[PDB]
């Protein structure tokens, strides 16, 4: 009842989840459960909106396949779903980010990513522009350029 009734009083919600935290995905933000009233073409622009919903469409299909993936892995998936899962896992890791306040814990220096860079980075991932790069390159970085740079020493 307490968090349930709180939802009515909010324009934006950041829904943290233990499963993401235990995976090392920080901040542990659920990308589908987290919502905002100002996620629309009028406020954030057409490209921002299209990329945002494109990311959520990939992650939604990845979420639907979890029961199958848990048992059988990725071997029995179709060629289309194999690509969706591969892009989803990279998206999931590029959504993580090192924090200035979390320097004491992790050891990595924090990063501030502008909106234009965030929209550009996830757009390029959706377009298959970084399919060649390994997964850990997307994990705990700022811009998409830092993911390209991290992939070299890996």
């Amino acid at each position: 009842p307490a968090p349930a009734t709180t939802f009515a009083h909010l324009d934006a919600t950041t829904n943290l989840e233990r499963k993401l935290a235990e995976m090392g995905i920080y901040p542990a933000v659920d990308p589908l459960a987290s919502t905002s009233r100002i996620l629309s073409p009028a406020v954030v622009g057409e490209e921002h909106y299209r990329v945002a919903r494109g990311v959520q469409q990939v992650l939604q299909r990845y979420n639907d396949l979890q029961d199958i993936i848990a048992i059988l892995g990725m071997d029995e998936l179709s060629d289309e779903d194999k690509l969706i899962v591969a892009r989803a896992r990279k998206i999931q890791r590029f959504l993580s980010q090192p924090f200035h306040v979390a320097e004491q814990f992790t050891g990595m220096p924090g990063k501030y990513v502008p909106v234009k860079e965030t929209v550009r980075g996830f757009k390029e991932i959706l377009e298959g522009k970084h399919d060649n790069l390994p997964e850990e390159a997307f994990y705990m970085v700022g811009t998409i350029d830092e993911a390209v740079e991290k992939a070299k020493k890996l």
Binding site: A70, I71, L72, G73, D75, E76
Partner: protein
């Protein structure tokens, strides 16, 4: 959550655990059978080699088109895959090697042709516009040589009349039940070192040594294709043991997680139900 939803899932995962566990044993039985069949195919092939090497040892200026290399205008490619799935990356790994080899080696589709032994490979090659000349599907789990004889004879015949000038075969080589390695092995032309090194013996030939040799050389090439099939089958069933062994271990992990969620909901439901009854009674008094 909702108990009805969780208990439905527990029934689903428990049944799925039983079948995956059962298919591991079914695959493992067929692994043994494929290896036992290979123990009969090996001396069968060695016997044919013995007679071929004996003929060549007692013939002046010995030569045959199947043993001689020549310039390669075209190349034949036999590719072994399974029909059924649930064999881990078995089919994915061997098809990756074929894709890498063809892209690096060839610049056009006219330079080669494909014999698709197995449904999974056939579908892969046809979907991406590869030149599939012939195919075979519905091969039994413990196969006989007769089940691949037509496509083998067709592939051997295409080398003999110079439709192509080389024939190799792609399959997963069996190392162990866990480990299977994609490889490419040459069939035609036959290497003179490995075919003519059998034990030499004095035989009479009827009608003659040339007539016997003309039967046995294509027959030896058939057994090389058959031995690759049996070894690929061993790799298939071993890969299915591992994949369904993992699926069984994953099912037991999930079944525990669901059992924790169920008993969390069961205890919560009884706690809530009894609390509402007692709250309702206290309101009167």
């Amino acid at each position: 959550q909702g108990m009805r939803e969780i208990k439905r899932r527990i029934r689903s995962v428990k049944n799925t655990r039983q079948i995956t566990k059962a298919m591991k044993m079914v695959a493992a039985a067929k692994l043994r059978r494929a290896q036992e069949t290979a123990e009969n195919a090996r001396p069968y092939a060695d016997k044919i080699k013995e007679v071929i090497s004996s003929i060549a040892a007692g013939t002046k200026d010995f030569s045959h088109p199947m043993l001689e290399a020549r310039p390669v205008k075209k190349t034949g490619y036999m590719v072994i895959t399974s029909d059924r799935g649930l064999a881990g990356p078995y089919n994915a790994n061997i098809l990756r090697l074929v894709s890498k080899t063809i892209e690096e080696r060839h610049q056009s589709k006219d330079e080669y042709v494909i014999f698709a032994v197995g449904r999974k490979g056939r579908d892969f090659f046809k979907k991406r516009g590869y030149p599939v000349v012939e195919e075979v599907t519905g091969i039994s789990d413990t196969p006989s040589l007769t089940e691949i004889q037509d496509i083998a004879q067709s592939a051997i015949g295409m080398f003999a009349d110079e439709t192509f000038d080389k024939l190799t075969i792609f399959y997963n080589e069996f190392v162990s039940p866990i480990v299977q390695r994609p490889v490419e092995k040459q069939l035609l032309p036959l290497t003179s070192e490995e075919v003519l090194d059998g034990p030499v013996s004095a035989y009479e030939y009827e009608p003659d040594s040339e007539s016997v040799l003309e039967v046995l050389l294509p027959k030896y090439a058939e057994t090389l294709i058959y031995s690759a099939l049996l070894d690929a089958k061993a790799s298939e069933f071993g890969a299915r043991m591992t994949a369904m062994g993992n699926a069984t271990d994953n099912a037991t992990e999930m079944l525990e997680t669901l059992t924790l969620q169920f008993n969390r909901a069961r205890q919560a439901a009884i706690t809530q139900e009894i609390a509402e009854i007692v709250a309702g009674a206290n309101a009167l008094r």
